[PDB]
């Protein structure tokens, strides 16, 4: 009804424009792109499903766009979120829903 | 005193205690005899006959550099080593009595300002530090991305225990991360503090299940008694209240220290208030510099610490002293020695006092992403400065650049929100 | 502000908590629009919703009088009122975060001190006080007719436990009251705290034993924790040791008040050590007087309070403070408001910094027998300063004006003492 | 020494506890001469005037038989009988003092290894056990038929609480009934123990409402003291968790069984980790062969033990040891004495060390049904581990030999399995 | 590995943790990559997804010497370096878990013996140490200038409760200033641990009544689990036992650091055996040197630790690592790495095995006063040891030679002493 | 969805031959056979109803198959498992799924 | 009876020659002797009543012996104890009697 999701969520649903240019800044910063899914979104609740593994040997962003819509294609009733990690500050440092059922 | 005290050739090891004080001698004292005065009232004081069942040498404070202060008349830096023995570990009540306890009152010094400590890695090692640290605190409230929103409700007296748990619903279910307790409410006539726990906890849960995101509201637990304390923070514990605040200053370090040790031992949060740091920072040429009090928060604990508004480059120096592992000395930015945290975890910056949606660009900016930017009143209010946040946000992620842009994406944002549109209004 | 929070013609209910507040503004501002500033940022900071939601009028701090500061420019003094319904009862650090917490980082004040505080009898019945007082510490040391005496333990670090009881062992045999830990001994690596309070009370044991008089040895319980706080002071009740030691601005209001209510309900005497005073009380145009921390550590608990060596009225003032039932306001003693304790006991001033014998009569005359008088080394001079003090003693009964006869009273004291005739030598 | 510590005829009581070294003497020392040395130098050591106040015979361990190795020079067996008086009930830890406390470093003999231990049943009954053991665990985790399936998360170090809970999350989703901690992992810097425990509790929950299966993750409760590994298994029960993990080495017998008791208590499974194993058992000619400490571990109490990879006779030997309720002597198995049990439950092995699912049809072999299988990495690899094992058990138990047709069960598996097709075409 | 685990250009940090490996490669691994190989068996292991998700290169051991041996071939010295961040604080057990944890085991290595570790200052200072240490010790039991002596309790098993009792009062009466438990001796039928507490204590207070001296007897409370030792500590302090005893490799080191923090809480002196050495120490070419474990006891916690008879330079190398602040690496001494302790007490050595009183000069030569001599048997015997001690401790102070003459200086003793001239008789 | 059960249930649905020959498996180590239905699939839930009683003299694994065949048509919407008991050991060495709704 | 003292009190008292020797000891290894004296000798008992300072600026063995001479002359019916500290090392390196009521 008016259930929230922590990042870009307050924004309008981010375009593929608006997405590959978040990955690209995810790219400048190093953040590898992780994508997950999950069928419900419960503010508890802390994991979700990872697709299929996280891209690490990356080089555009229209991959990681890739990997989301093939995601989009196996799980449409899902949500799905893009996580990066800086592994030398070991902070998450995204995680914004890129894909809502 | 300059004869023992004043060592200009010796080389601090890496286990001393370094302390940077800003002096100005009483007309006719001599500015290296001054230094040394403080390298000797800060550890030994000044013969007796217990002295020779002792070695003298080995518990000296020794002062090891003294220069003159750039562009000032009478004032000079003093950098005094003191031995790691001197101190009891995991005791900043004790690093405090040691460096500050005395020299403060010495005659032959005008003016004396404590600038900075270097903690050596072997005492950081013997503290706890912060109950959680920056990042998992941002995996246990699940948030990522952006800096966390916090409103401190009003008014800060007067407001019954259910119409606070009222204030602090609309808030929290208009978009912010956090509300909080204002320093002045502990447990007054008008407002018991288990009443106003209940109802907060009540409100957090609603505006939980309602926005589906983690809530918090920082609980005051500052108690006149150490017991009162633990009955406040084990009743926050009770309800599931993720977070808590404390006063560090006016309730002291040792009880700071012994509740983010059951912080840690119970998974709360400790944000971390700073009244009364004006009556020890504000002047500049007394007391002590605010960035030393954060400096011994992060060894005592805190997750959060309240950090002021935004010298800007002083306050970027103090929030890289409670962030980042690894700080070189920087003068211009007020770190007058390098600080090693041996992964100690940081300390998330609270900036306040009125933070103003139009002056977000400039916060988002200035602090990055790990910051709680906390508003000094409802839930389009909240939603106006989620959405601003948000978008400043995306758009410093996008590449533009926040401080030339930010009115321009401000006012984009405000197109598509309505909220966001009235507040810019405003 | 103005407007609402000065009221020049409110008079103060008995009920009302008052502050005396110095303030310069800075150039521009007048000084009533400053002292309603003074009100308002003690108060309520400054509208919201919430705000309807209660009485705002009954929750405000009042300015009700302005006064320049006689022989000064750009100076005056703000007397606020503040209800009684603004404070949690019994809580020193919730009276100081309400009144001092923000009111120092305004900006339109160039400068502010805060001089005294009325505390209302209704405010201090919610309070412990000192756990035992003037009278019932006589009464439980069996000491009566003079001041106490006291050395602090040199060198401040350095000695084994074992070798620190043998210097408490020889100052106490040699006739003095109290020997005293030095504010920078808490647990060492040279010295942990259980060995040393072990041999502490085998020299208090010995020594009583030797002289058929009560001893003490104010150990210091001052921990970086409250657990390690309550363990240090639950071995020294174990051991029977008659009073502790506590540093209450460096620790903190709530680790005091917790350590008073401790010491009253097993029988302890409390020291209050102020480490750290200088940084808030030194500078005469910013921070706060020390007679206002007197106050509070006197609600808070404290049978000690240090008071400095000897502006000689001032002292005294804030000496009647801590030890009368009612003193009356006098701007020469620095008293601005007149004080009722509600016949809560009174706490004993200790005065020290290296009193030199030859001074005794002069703190003998200034002080009075309610007082402890400490030494900053060996049973001999011990003897001397006893044999000196009640030499003072005596001659003030008998009398003599201690002030125009005090050398002439040591001088005869000393004709049949061999151990003053040597320090009166020196 | 012979005459009085070897006694050839001697037969074993039902009582005696008894123990099988392999020593090698120095030249000159007959083989005898130093057998009987070793049952003195464990039982008496070697005359005062306090001897002849004791019955001396009766508490003295006898050398009942030597013999050579074969195909070995200068080795041989020795066999001594100790009274059940000389051992405190329910401690490993004094039977552990008696018998290898100091014989090992007797000057006559060159080189020593305890082989076996005969744990008499009047000497079991006075131990715990297993807190639960295979039956019971069995039944809790609702798992039958087949081994258990574990995988070690990697890397050890560096993940953070919220990382690692990740991983197990994808490990046990993936068909794996446990995960588990390294070794190495207690409560570093990187991760504090309790933000992991809660992170790898979410992580399980989240499994086990996905899979429908009970799942598990062997939560590292070794800790530097007994109170802070009491509050890591407490907080491992608060959150529901099956099972914990201890280190019995490097923590030590007490603590072991301190813990086991406190498993049975409790309802919790306790995984053993042999960390340091391989400091007393690796070399063939010195040390405490591994059967040992297995056996001293069941008794200690432990669900779980880590066994080796897979001398494959010997391994089967103490696997046997470990598991069954009486265990004949078998030297070409390793077992030196019969094992009576008296209906004490039996231990897991667990087998790891990367073992390479090609290798699953062997190792269903060879440990059957009552083990784990401990993989050395996501939920695809997890799929394939648990269909290979699963084909190899349905193929098992359909005859089919595991040995020979292991490649074409697995490739036969495969057809109808993308993730096992993957795996087998790695 | 070599590539990335051999460092031979890697300066270590102050704040890394050195460990000194002797190994021999198996026949075709050269010596740089078994270096690496020990280097990375001890801290990584060895890809994974979550590999990525972590700094690899942080947390990496880093081989940054090898060298060969001297006088041996295929035998070298491997210099290992790691961070800070790997080890929990205060824990010994996570450091041994760490770093021997599983290197022992790797097949490509034929011998492995772990020589050294280097404990950095920073590791040192979240470790309590020794409860007391050799300086609070001597101050607690008043014995000064000379080395303490006991005497174990013979025979070890047989003995009831009241005539240990007796045997520990005849031996304390002589002249010793310790008795002992047997390690043996925890809760046996013949004697339950509780009346030997007893009938010690009793023996104790009339040896002590009777000669005027502090008295000892190491009561063993090792026991079975965690809560039986507990009890058993207790009821010693109940009795006023001033030191207990523990076996800290077979009851473990959480367990001996339980006992350690108990002891310094409650004023007990710990003596620590050794049994099981052996089985780790004494192959030259495998296992753990034992001055690794006395400095891992040192850390844990321990006022004495027996430290063997008496390679003679060796032995005195780890009493100087057990006793001293600061040790310079001395090969000849095997002290691989300058060890700095920052101030934590040394533990006192315990020379034992029938140190034979003709041989007390050279033991005190040797040792020096900071020693415990343990004789492995009457009062006149007692008095005999005490005689000769306290000559030899005369004559070595008075400048003659202890080595030359000993002989001479015994028979000096002797003339004058019966009971020495019996025992120097035989 | 992706519902899994303790043992072969990560392999295709067993057949009618893949049944009888772990019941002839079942019947050489002595387990005789207890076949129990449940309505749900639960972890936490440990016991099943059993299907009338253990089947103590059991000659033929086709009189299992019968049992579970009528309990199908009885149950048709229930689960089914095939149990063994080891009564020396005194272990249960079989649980597996032959029928899911 | 048969009380002991802690060290050197199972030889014969010390003469002074012998006195003089550990004295002498004490200045070589820079132990500033301090004298003490107590009416009794307790093993409980910590302290004693030092005797008037600690000799730091000692020179000979025979100034000791002089202040322990009039000890003896002042507290003949008392025992008298020479103590010396190693402050560098922070120990008491010696504690023996000299004098017996």
Redo the contacts between chains.
């Keep these: 009804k008016e259930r929230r999701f922590e990042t870009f969520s307050y924004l309008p649903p981010l375009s593929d424009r608006q997405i590959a240019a978040q990955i690209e800044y995810m790219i400048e910063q190093g953040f590898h792109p992780l994508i997950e899914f999950n069928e419900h979104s419960n503010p508890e609740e802390f994991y979700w499903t990872m697709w299929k593994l996280p891209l690490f040997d990356c080089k555009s962003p229209q991959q990681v766009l890739d990997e989301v819509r093939e995601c989009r294609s196996e799980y449409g009733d899902c949500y799905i979120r893009v996580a990066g990690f800086d592994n030398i500050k070991q902070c998450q440092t995204v995680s914004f829903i890129v894909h809502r059922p | 005193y300059k004869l023992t005290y004043y060592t200009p050739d010796y080389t601090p090891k890496?286990?001393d205690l370094l302390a940077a004080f800003r002096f100005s001698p009483q007309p006719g004292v001599p500015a290296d005899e001054a230094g040394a005065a403080i390298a000797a009232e800060s550890?030994?004081?000044t013969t007796?006959?217990?002295?020779?069942?002792?070695?003298?040498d080995?518990?000296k404070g020794k002062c090891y550099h003294i220069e003159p202060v750039q562009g000032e008349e009478n004032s000079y830096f003093a950098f005094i080593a003191y031995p790691?023995?001197?101190?009891?570990?995991?005791?900043?009540?004790?690093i405090?009595?040691?460096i500050?306890?005395?020299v403060?009152?010495f005659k032959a010094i005008r003016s004396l300002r404590l600038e900075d400590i270097r903690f050596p890695?072997?005492?950081?090692?013997?503290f706890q530090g912060p109950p959680?640290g920056?990042?998992?605190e941002?995996?246990?409230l699940?948030?990522?991305?952006?800096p966390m929103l916090g409103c401190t409700?009003?008014?800060?007296?007067?407001?019954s225990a259910k119409?606070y748990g009222?204030?602090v619903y609309e808030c929290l279910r208009g978009?912010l991360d956090f509300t909080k307790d204002d320093?002045?409410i502990?447990?007054?006539?008008?407002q018991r503090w288990r009443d106003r726990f209940l109802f907060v906890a009540d409100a957090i849960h609603k505006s939980?299940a309602?926005?589906?995101?983690?809530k918090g509201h920082y609980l005051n637990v500052?108690?006149?008694?150490?017991?009162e304390?633990m009955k406040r923070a084990e009743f926050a514990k009770e309800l599931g209240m993720p977070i808590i605040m404390h006063?560090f200053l006016?309730?002291?370090?040792?009880?700071?220290?012994?509740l983010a040790?059951w912080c840690?031992?119970n998974?709360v949060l400790l944000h971390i208030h700073r009244?009364?740091?004006?009556?020890?920072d504000?002047?500049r040429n007394?007391?002590?510099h605010f960035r030393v009090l954060a400096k011994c928060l992060r060894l005592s604990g805190g997750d959060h610490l309240h950090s002021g508004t935004v010298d800007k480059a002083s306050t970027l120096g103090f929030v890289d002293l409670m962030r980042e592992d690894h700080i070189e000395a920087d003068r211009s930015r007020g770190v007058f020695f390098t600080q090693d945290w041996?992964?100690?975890?940081g300390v998330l910056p609270v900036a306040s006092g009125g933070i103003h949606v139009w002056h977000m660009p400039a916060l988002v900016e200035i602090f990055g992403?790990?910051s709680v930017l906390q508003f000094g009143?409802?839930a389009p209010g909240a939603?106006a400065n989620?959405?601003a946040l948000?978008?400043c946000?995306?758009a410093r992620?996008?590449?533009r650049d926040l401080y030339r842009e930010g009115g321009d994406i401000l006012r984009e944002?405000g197109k598509?929100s309505p909220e966001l549109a009235a507040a810019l209004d405003l």
């Design positions: 890496d286990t550890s030994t004081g007796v006959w217990t002295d020779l069942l002792t070695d003298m080995r518990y790691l023995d001197l101190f009891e570990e995991g005791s900043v009540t004790n405090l009595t040691s500050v306890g005395n403060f009152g890695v072997a005492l950081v090692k013997t959680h920056i990042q998992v941002r995996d246990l699940n948030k990522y991305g952006r409700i009003k008014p800060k007296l007067g407001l119409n009222r204030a978009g320093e002045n502990n447990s007054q006539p008008f939980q309602e926005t589906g995101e983690i500052t108690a006149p008694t150490c017991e304390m006063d006016t309730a002291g370090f040792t009880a700071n220290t012994t040790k840690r031992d998974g009244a009364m740091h004006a009556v020890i504000r002047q007394h007391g002590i041996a992964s100690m975890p992403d790990d009143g409802n939603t989620r959405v948000e978008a946000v995306q992620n996008e590449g944002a598509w």
